[PDB]
């Protein structure tokens, strides 16, 4: 009923931190993302993950990195974690020079394509927009798609919020909840605490009325088959 987290290694935590984009793309610099990246590095380090930070990767570099990691031998590793910090659209995350399909990234780790991760939890944490909606708020033995979890910062169709000084609402909340609860709660319960923190404690402040007083709810997509405990 619980994933075996007893392997000699917890696993890799790959962090892709895209801050600066090619001028031709017209995408803005993502101020505050370094705060996210360092926060995640320390957070996952504490959970005994082998963290690898990568900054400002082209769409080609993203695909290549994911391919290479998926080809590594994860036999002695309990799990796998990938954190993507960038611009995005529905189903898409941006390299510094253009988009990459999230499906193409996650496909490398399918149960049939990454044999040494089969039966192990594969976690993708995505801080990126998923469209342009704003929330105004109110008052074979095993399936190849099994054992993935996707923790999206925001609802499908919606912008995701990042504070230039404090980092993104989602990553801020995720790291805080992991620090506080990773020694006591199952991962889905931790992520539910993250949902509540983002939903209740954050609200945008803008001089632009269109973007002022807006809200955010993250979205957990779980195809996990067992409970995941970090201890």
């Amino acid at each position: 009923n619980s994933y075996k987290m007893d392997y000699p290694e917890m696993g890799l935590c790959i962090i892709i931190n895209n801050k600066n984009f090619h001028k031709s793309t017209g995408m803005t610099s993502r101020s505050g993302t370094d705060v996210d990246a360092a926060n995640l590095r320390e957070t996952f380090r504490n959970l005994k993950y082998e963290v690898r930070n990568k900054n400002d990767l082209t769409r080609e570099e993203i695909v290549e990195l994911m391919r290479d990691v998926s080809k590594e031998d994860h036999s002695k590793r309990s799990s796998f974690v990938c954190v993507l910090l960038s611009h995005g659209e529905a189903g898409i995350i941006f390299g510094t020079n253009g988009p990459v399909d999230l499906k193409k990234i996650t496909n490398f780790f399918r149960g049939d394509r990454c044999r040494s991760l089969t039966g192990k939890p594969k976690l993708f944490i995505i801080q990126a927009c998923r469209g342009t909606e704003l929330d105004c708020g109110i008052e074979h033995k095993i399936p190849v798609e099994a054992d993935f979890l996707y923790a999206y910062s925001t609802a499908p169709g919606y912008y995701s919020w990042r504070n230039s000084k404090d980092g993104s609402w989602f990553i801020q909340s995720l790291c805080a909840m992991l620090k506080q609860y990773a020694d006591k709660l199952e991962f889905m319960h931790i992520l539910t605490r993250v949902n509540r923190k983002v939903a209740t404690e954050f609200e945008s402040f803008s001089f632009d009325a269109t973007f002022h007083a807006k809200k955010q709810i993250p979205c957990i997509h779980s195809m996990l088959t067992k409970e995941l405990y970090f201890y």
């Binding site: 993502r30 101020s31 611009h87 801080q127 912008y159 990042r162 504070n163 230039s164 402040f205």
Partner: peptide, 4 residues
């Protein structure tokens, strides 16, 4: 506050 900025959007991604």
């Amino acid at each position: 506050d900025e959007v991604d």
